[PDB]
Amino acid sequence: EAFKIGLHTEFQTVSFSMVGLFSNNPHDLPLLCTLNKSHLYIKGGNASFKISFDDIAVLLPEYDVIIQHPADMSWCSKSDDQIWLSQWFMNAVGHDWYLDPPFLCRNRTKTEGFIFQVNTSKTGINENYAKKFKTGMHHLYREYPDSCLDGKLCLMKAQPTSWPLQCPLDHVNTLHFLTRGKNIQLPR
Amino acid sequence: EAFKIGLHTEFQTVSFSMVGLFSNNPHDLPLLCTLNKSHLYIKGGNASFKISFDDIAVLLPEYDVIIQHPADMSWCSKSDDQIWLSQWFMNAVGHDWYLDPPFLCRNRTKTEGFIFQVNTSKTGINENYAKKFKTGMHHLYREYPDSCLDGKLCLMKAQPTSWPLQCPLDHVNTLHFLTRGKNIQLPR
Amino acid sequence: EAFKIGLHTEFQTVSFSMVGLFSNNPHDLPLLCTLNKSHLYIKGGNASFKISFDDIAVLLPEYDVIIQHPADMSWCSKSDDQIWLSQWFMNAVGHDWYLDPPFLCRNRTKTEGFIFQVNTSKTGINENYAKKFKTGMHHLYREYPDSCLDGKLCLMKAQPTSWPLQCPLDHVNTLHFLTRGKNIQLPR
Amino acid sequence: GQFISFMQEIPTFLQEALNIALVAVSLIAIIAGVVNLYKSGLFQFFVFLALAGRSC
Amino acid sequence: GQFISFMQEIPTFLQEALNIALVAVSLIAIIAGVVNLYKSGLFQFFVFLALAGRSC
Amino acid sequence: GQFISFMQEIPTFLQEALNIALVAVSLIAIIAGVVNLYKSGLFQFFVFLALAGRSC
Amino acid sequence: GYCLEEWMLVAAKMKCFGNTAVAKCNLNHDSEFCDMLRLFDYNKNAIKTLQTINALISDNLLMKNKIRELMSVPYCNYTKFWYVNHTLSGQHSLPRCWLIKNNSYLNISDFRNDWILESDFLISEMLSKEYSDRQGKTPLTLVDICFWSTVFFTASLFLHLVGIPTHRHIRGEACPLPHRLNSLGGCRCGKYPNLKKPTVWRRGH
Amino acid sequence: GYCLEEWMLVAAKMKCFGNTAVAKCNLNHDSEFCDMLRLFDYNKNAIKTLQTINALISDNLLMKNKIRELMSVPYCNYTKFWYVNHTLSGQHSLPRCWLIKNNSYLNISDFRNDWILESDFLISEMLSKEYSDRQGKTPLTLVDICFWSTVFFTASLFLHLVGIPTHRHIRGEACPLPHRLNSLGGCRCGKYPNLKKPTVWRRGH
Amino acid sequence: GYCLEEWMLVAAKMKCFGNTAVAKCNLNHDSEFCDMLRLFDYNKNAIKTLQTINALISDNLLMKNKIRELMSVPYCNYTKFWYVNHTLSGQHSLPRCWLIKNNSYLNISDFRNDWILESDFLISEMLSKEYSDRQGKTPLTLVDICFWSTVFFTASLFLHLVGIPTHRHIRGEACPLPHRLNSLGGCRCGKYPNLKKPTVWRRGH
Numbered sequence A, B, C: 001e002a003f004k005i006g007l008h009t010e011f012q013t014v015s016f017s018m019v020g021l022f023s024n025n026p027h028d029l030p031l032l033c034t035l036n037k038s039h040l041y042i043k044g045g046n047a048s049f050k051i052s053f054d055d056i057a058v059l060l061p062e063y064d065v066i067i068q069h070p071a072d073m074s075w076c077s078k079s080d081d082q083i084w085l086s087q088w089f090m091n092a093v094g095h096d097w098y099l100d101p102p103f104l105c106r107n108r109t110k111t112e113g114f115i116f117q118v119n120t121s122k123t124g125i126n127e128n129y130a131k132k133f134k135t136g137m138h139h140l141y142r143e144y145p146d147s148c149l150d151g152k153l154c155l156m157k158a159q160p161t162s163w164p165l166q167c168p169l170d171h172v173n174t175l176h177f178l179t180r181g182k183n184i185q186l187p188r
Numbered sequence D, E, F: 001g002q003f004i005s006f007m008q009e010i011p012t013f014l015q016e017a018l019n020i021a022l023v024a025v026s027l028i029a030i031i032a033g034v035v036n037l038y039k040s041g042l043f044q045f046f047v048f049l050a051l052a053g054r055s056c
Numbered sequence G, H, I: 001g002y003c004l005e006e007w008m009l010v011a012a013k014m015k016c017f018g019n020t021a022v023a024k025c026n027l028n029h030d031s032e033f034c035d036m037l038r039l040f041d042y043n044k045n046a047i048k049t050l051q052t053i054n055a056l057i058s059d060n061l062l063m064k065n066k067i068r069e070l071m072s073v074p075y076c077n078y079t080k081f082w083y084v085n086h087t088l089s090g091q092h093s094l095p096r097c098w099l100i101k102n103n104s105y106l107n108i109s110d111f112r113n114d115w116i117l118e119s120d121f122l123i124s125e126m127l128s129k130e131y132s133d134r135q136g137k138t139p140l141t142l143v144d145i146c147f148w149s150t151v152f153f154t155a156s157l158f159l160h161l162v163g164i165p166t167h168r169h170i171r172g173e174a175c176p177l178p179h180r181l182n183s184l185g186g187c188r189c190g191k192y193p194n195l196k197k198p199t200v201w202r203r204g205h
């Protein structure tokens, strides 16, 4: 609030609106929002996921698509926007497609939805990859509610969900996402 | 032109000669220049290509070489300088050798010259690669005469040709080429 | 030395202790010391190598372990820290795991120690890679004593050795190593 | 000019000893200038010039 | 020293009121100093010292 | 105050003509002020105030 | 940049900033407000008229704020800024970030020192700006000439009051003028011989 | 590149720049002329004597110029630079790029305001440099001492003219000196008893 | 790093530096000493309390030193720093790296010019800081008012000495007071009518 601090000097404040910033935009900036805690969401294009870290393993390496190259995600979803969002999210977290372990993804033909699962467990050979993933998630999400304990296995699932209109409109997350996304192409 | 603007103050100009910047240099710097419009050229080491964009496909993937790794260019041309210039041009235009579609090249034994062709058409699956190629070409070439219309086929070809002595000698193009080329090894 | 240069003005010096900086540090920073000349050492975590350049070829491509991916190092040494130090040393030098020639290593099962060899010769097709290796070694080591002459073959060997407590402690080398290490997961 | 804005900021300036000294010196100089112009006869000269034979 | 450059650059300075005021004050001060040194007798003192009994 | 610190740094300042000129003008002005305060009668007035009818 | 529209601000108003404060953005690479101005000016320019988004913001500052968030020390989430504004003159400081801790805005009492120092610096900056504007128009040589002319005129008044002696006299002796005297006390006309009499200076009669 | 040889300029002449202007190159990284100086200094240094090219050129300037080219707004070709030069003193401003639009050099009426402001800034910079050289050479305390000494001397002249009374007198009476008077009008010697008469101050006789 | 503890310095002491010198680190990104201060501040801050290492050191300056040692010209190895210190007031310059060349510390005679210029700049900066502190507190308008009041007072003393004529007399003719005269020395009363005679401007009686 404005209040006087000297004879004529007055403490004054200016606050920036983010709805206006996102409304007026030459591109479709990605959205990264954290409703309550341990409920992470992401929005880009028409795709909107719900990042969830659980101890369960919905996708197994010997039953689902092994993804070591971005072009292998053709058997992951009919919608190309979902593949685009998943690829650029994995790039933003810091997933090097040549030096990092592959992550599973559900077969497109199966009618059980689009789910891709990334092994973010801090155990054994996955230690460095999980640490890099935690780095990326702290970058992308501020006040990131880490739930992947040391030793215990922790696997994320990203599945489509309705975007929560009650979730806030943070823009620092978008800034970090764009910085880490390298040469990302945003649709008009 | 010099002219007076105050009592003792004179407007004055200085210009930098660029023949004395390139011809008088320790290393050999890439040359990127344009005649008129849509007549791009490039020169590095001894190789001098003529970048040409056209609808027709000189090289088809069924009959010619597929280049997905830089070492596969050994089947392109006898001259190693041509291979070097092609590799570094493709690095400058932003081509990733692991995440981008492979580009063709004429067999070294097939005696119809050294030609490598890149599918830069902004059509369907090739859209992001074509846009990235367009970005790279705008960086490398100042006032880049884009001809790859949206939807229509646009495949570039690079044939060796005599370097035009009547071509303006630009240096911002060289600066962008060196900046994007990362760890380039310029011949001395 | 402190001495007067004006009336009340005195020349004075401050010197920084390096052992305090290294020991007081929370993380375990790599060490790189050049004792005498052509006698390079390196130490990070627990492993401590001795970089040696010589014309002999201890390891041959067809009888030892060929490394073209970092995961192929799991057949080199039982100790994970040695593998980690080797990987990050190669990353700091500037070894691209997709665009650079593979380097050899000894089989873990064979009981002749942990040795990995890199062809740093500036001969024939191995022109750019050895120059990049020289660049990296000049960055890592202050006043790097280059021994790989042009044309003549020169092969690097890295073997475990006792860390020489007599070699000077340098932090500029550590700074260059960390800068070139990209996303290095330093032990706590 | 700058004087009208300077008059508004006077209470802020009179917190340093030098500013008070400058104000006091200025006022004393103006007062002394007025008194010794009166002693010189400039005011009397102007009054006489106004009363150029019109009165006695 | 700087007086020659200032002499060359005066035409540019005489566009602000303060500069013209400073020039006028300087000239008036120099003129008044000359006239009241003449009134004091310094010039007469030096002239007499030059003619130290050499004339009458 | 600043005078005590300025006292120590004087030998460093007396290397330029302007600083020597300022010191000379300050000293001459102080001396002249003392002599013409003595001429005015301020010191005599102070002495008389001290000897307020206590002697003759 | 220099001015902001209603959609740019939480409260729909025509708030518009000064010139020097926003000119400090060009020189300063460590300021969240200047980065946000760059971003919003870019958006307003490119909405219909004519790595930009990431080369419009300072990566170093954003990384510093992320590190501060990880350290659990106060950081900036780029939404609310405060500044000290001289009401009469309209000259204000560059809006600093209202730092955040515990997902809540810091109270005014936490950076009371910060904004007190900001107000003091703003007053000092206005006075220094006035001095610099004076120094950029009036030459130093003219100031020196005026000062030395005034000193010369004061010395001239002092000499006028005291009076410089003009000729030579002798204790208990008449005025020798128009006949001058030498050091000994008499010129060569023969009227006043060199009697080696001590001479006493007197001023013009 | 304090001086420039003939092969680096289109005109086959040697042009050398002042130290004060080129000293801004170390501080400023938003000037194409400084990048060109660095590049050409490296080129001339290493011709026979002794990512250097990309550390010599500010990537931010190249990116900004490329974006401006893509926005079809005036940008710099890094070819021709214009500067404002004081002929008599030789002091000059740091050269700025002669911006190009539509692949043509702009005309001198488009940036008329730019070079007029540059000339005014150069004059102001010279005067401010004179002031700064004075301030770093002459102590402020000595200036204050001189000013206060002059003020005290002027006040002393004023007191000299007006005159300060030295003793006490009474209307219609001669000088009591050498016999003093009190506030009432008479000391304790008995020659002047305390008559409580009003006293009139008078100056020295 | 305003102060430094014992484990950070060879010959362990508690050498603590000033405020302006360490404040120059925020603006400057071309100082090895400031980079090492950032590194040690990070090290001591996070030892138990609470790419940080590469965001703490300037990569451009490290690369510059690497190129300089590859050029075999003097460079810095971030070990020893020299600074110029005013013993009495305690003000000191920001420490500069003791440059190394051919694996040996440069002798003092090589950068004699450097430390002489550093001492001169330190004294100049002290005096300039005193002037700036004065200018940030005392308004320029008050200084101008005092100067013009003093000039007016001095001119007033001059007019007091010379004396301005008041009435209008006539050559040889006595004082007509009280009776004013016109430009021709006349009046309506007829006591001294328009006789067309030369007039004497004599001062007040």
Ligand SMILES: *[C@@H]1O[C@H](CO)[C@@H](O[C@@H]2O[C@H](CO)[C@@H](O)[C@H](O)[C@H]2NC(C)=O)[C@H](O)[C@H]1NC(C)=O
Pocket (backbone or CB within 6 Å): A057, A059, A060, A061, A119, A121, A123, A124, A125, A126, A151, A153, A155
């Ligand atoms: C996710 O990664 C973890 C890595 O620890 C996998 O778990 C281990 O897998 C190895 C395979 O040889 C077993 O030997 C270990 O016992 C497993 N558990 C540990 C060490 O905690 C896990 O299976 C991976 N999950 C998926 C779905 O691939």
Ligand SMILES: *[C@@H]1O[C@H](CO)[C@@H](O[C@@H]2O[C@H](CO)[C@@H](O)[C@H](O)[C@H]2NC(C)=O)[C@H](O)[C@H]1NC(C)=O
Pocket (backbone or CB within 6 Å): A018, A168, A169, A170, A171, A172, G077, G078, G079, G100, G103, G104, G105
């Ligand atoms: C920065 O953090 C502050 C504090 O958490 C957020 O301020 C909130 O903003 C919303 C939307 O205007 C208000 O309804 C809340 O009352 C504000 N305060 C709190 C304590 O929540 C602000 O939104 C954050 N900025 C961003 C971009 O996320």
Ligand SMILES: *[C@@H]1O[C@H](CO)[C@@H](O[C@@H]2O[C@H](CO)[C@@H](O)[C@H](O)[C@H]2NC(C)=O)[C@H](O)[C@H]1NC(C)=O
Pocket (backbone or CB within 6 Å): B057, B059, B060, B061, B119, B121, B123, B124, B125, B126, B151, B152, B153, B155
């Ligand atoms: C260059 O890329 C385009 C787009 O991928 C290729 O054109 C399409 O290719 C598919 C598969 O052969 C055809 O079914 C389409 O009809 C083609 N048409 C378009 C315009 O999409 C094109 O063949 C590629 N060229 C080369 C030489 O490989």
Ligand SMILES: *[C@@H]1O[C@H](CO)[C@@H](O[C@@H]2O[C@H](CO)[C@@H](O)[C@H](O)[C@H]2NC(C)=O)[C@H](O)[C@H]1NC(C)=O
Pocket (backbone or CB within 6 Å): C057, C059, C060, C061, C119, C121, C123, C124, C125, C126, C151, C152, C153, C155
């Ligand atoms: C290290 O690299 C060099 C250069 O590539 C290899 O030597 C060349 O090998 C080719 C193929 O056999 C020969 O044609 C050349 O004549 C060789 N050059 C020399 C100078 O010997 C060398 O064999 C490699 N070493 C290892 C350990 O693989």
Ligand SMILES: *[C@@H]1O[C@H](CO)[C@@H](O[C@@H]2O[C@H](CO)[C@@H](O)[C@H](O)[C@H]2NC(C)=O)[C@H](O)[C@H]1NC(C)=O
Pocket (backbone or CB within 6 Å): C018, C168, C169, C170, C171, C172, I077, I078, I079, I100, I103, I104, I105
């Ligand atoms: C920077 O270089 C200097 C000069 O070579 C090194 O100074 C030596 O430091 C050691 C350890 O304190 C002393 O024993 C030597 O006498 C010093 N002088 C010389 C000439 O060797 C200094 O160690 C270097 N800094 C680093 C971090 O390596």
Ligand SMILES: *[C@@H]1O[C@H](CO)[C@@H](O[C@@H]2O[C@H](CO)[C@@H](O)[C@H](O)[C@H]2NC(C)=O)[C@H](O)[C@H]1NC(C)=O
Pocket (backbone or CB within 6 Å): A012, G014, G015, G016, G017, G018, G085, G086, G087, G088, G090, G092
């Ligand atoms: C500082 O405060 C002043 C005074 O309130 C502001 O000046 C006002 O600006 C608004 C803009 O809409 C005008 O409507 C008012 O008439 C102005 N008032 C006066 C007295 O001039 C100034 O804008 C403030 N500075 C800020 C907010 O940065």
Ligand SMILES: *[C@@H]1O[C@H](CO)[C@@H](O[C@@H]2O[C@H](CO)[C@@H](O)[C@H](O)[C@H]2NC(C)=O)[C@H](O)[C@H]1NC(C)=O
Pocket (backbone or CB within 6 Å): B012, H015, H016, H017, H018, H085, H086, H087, H088, H089, H090, H092
């Ligand atoms: C600014 O203009 C002046 C006046 O032409 C230039 O100074 C002259 O430079 C030439 C060439 O070196 C000398 O022969 C003259 O003697 C110089 N004159 C004076 C008065 O110094 C000056 O070089 C110009 N500055 C530039 C071009 O940067």
Ligand SMILES: *[C@@H]1O[C@H](CO)[C@@H](O[C@@H]2O[C@H](CO)[C@@H](O)[C@H](O)[C@H]2NC(C)=O)[C@H](O)[C@H]1NC(C)=O
Pocket (backbone or CB within 6 Å): B018, B168, B169, B170, B171, B172, H077, H078, H079, H100, H101, H103, H104, H105
């Ligand atoms: C930068 O662009 C300008 C035009 O925008 C070029 O100026 C031309 O230069 C040539 C060669 O001297 C002249 O013949 C032309 O008359 C100039 N003007 C034009 C074309 O309008 C300049 O050469 C360019 N510089 C570089 C290095 O490419």
Ligand SMILES: *[C@@H]1O[C@H](CO)[C@@H](O[C@@H]2O[C@H](CO)[C@@H](O)[C@H](O)[C@H]2NC(C)=O)[C@H](O)[C@H]1NC(C)=O
Pocket (backbone or CB within 6 Å): C012, I014, I015, I016, I017, I018, I085, I086, I087, I088, I090, I092
């Ligand atoms: C500059 O020299 C002075 C005088 O030697 C130093 O001030 C001394 O600081 C030490 C601690 O560093 C105190 O123990 C002394 O009492 C101080 N002396 C005085 C007279 O104040 C000052 O620290 C030096 N500046 C540096 C080292 O940066």
Ligand SMILES: *[C@@H]1O[C@H](CO)[C@@H](O)[C@H](O)[C@H]1NC(C)=O
Pocket (backbone or CB within 6 Å): A065, A075, A107, A108, A109
């Ligand atoms: C399952 O996925 C693979 C690709 O990994 C695809 O070839 C296959 O057709 C899919 N399954 C079925 C039953 O079609």
Ligand SMILES: *[C@@H]1O[C@H](CO)[C@@H](O)[C@H](O)[C@H]1NC(C)=O
Pocket (backbone or CB within 6 Å): B065, B075, B107, B108, B109, B110
């Ligand atoms: C075509 O290229 C291959 C290698 O890609 C080579 O083996 C072959 O000889 C070339 N052409 C002929 C003559 O078949």
Ligand SMILES: *[C@@H]1O[C@H](CO)[C@@H](O)[C@H](O)[C@H]1NC(C)=O
Pocket (backbone or CB within 6 Å): C065, C075, C107, C108, C109, C110
């Ligand atoms: C040698 O290495 C390979 C893997 O590279 C491994 O399969 C093999 O067991 C090792 N050799 C022997 C004799 O065991």
Ligand SMILES: *[C@@H]1O[C@H](CO)[C@@H](O)[C@H](O)[C@H]1NC(C)=O
Pocket (backbone or CB within 6 Å): G102, G103
């Ligand atoms: C921080 O915020 C949390 C939000 O739940 C609150 O409970 C807590 O009191 C705050 N303070 C600390 C010191 O944790």
Ligand SMILES: *[C@@H]1O[C@H](CO)[C@@H](O)[C@H](O)[C@H]1NC(C)=O
Pocket (backbone or CB within 6 Å): H102, H103, H104
């Ligand atoms: C742009 O430049 C050309 C020459 O390059 C000139 O003829 C033309 O008038 C200019 N404007 C447009 C709109 O083409």
Ligand SMILES: *[C@@H]1O[C@H](CO)[C@@H](O)[C@H](O)[C@H]1NC(C)=O
Pocket (backbone or CB within 6 Å): H107, H108
């Ligand atoms: C640009 O300046 C020149 C200067 O001679 C002038 O002739 C011309 O008319 C100006 N602009 C145009 C293209 O009209």
Ligand SMILES: *[C@@H]1O[C@H](CO)[C@@H](O)[C@H](O)[C@H]1NC(C)=O
Pocket (backbone or CB within 6 Å): I102
């Ligand atoms: C460097 O110093 C060494 C010390 O042994 C000396 O031999 C050598 O000549 C020096 N190199 C020079 C001065 O270039």
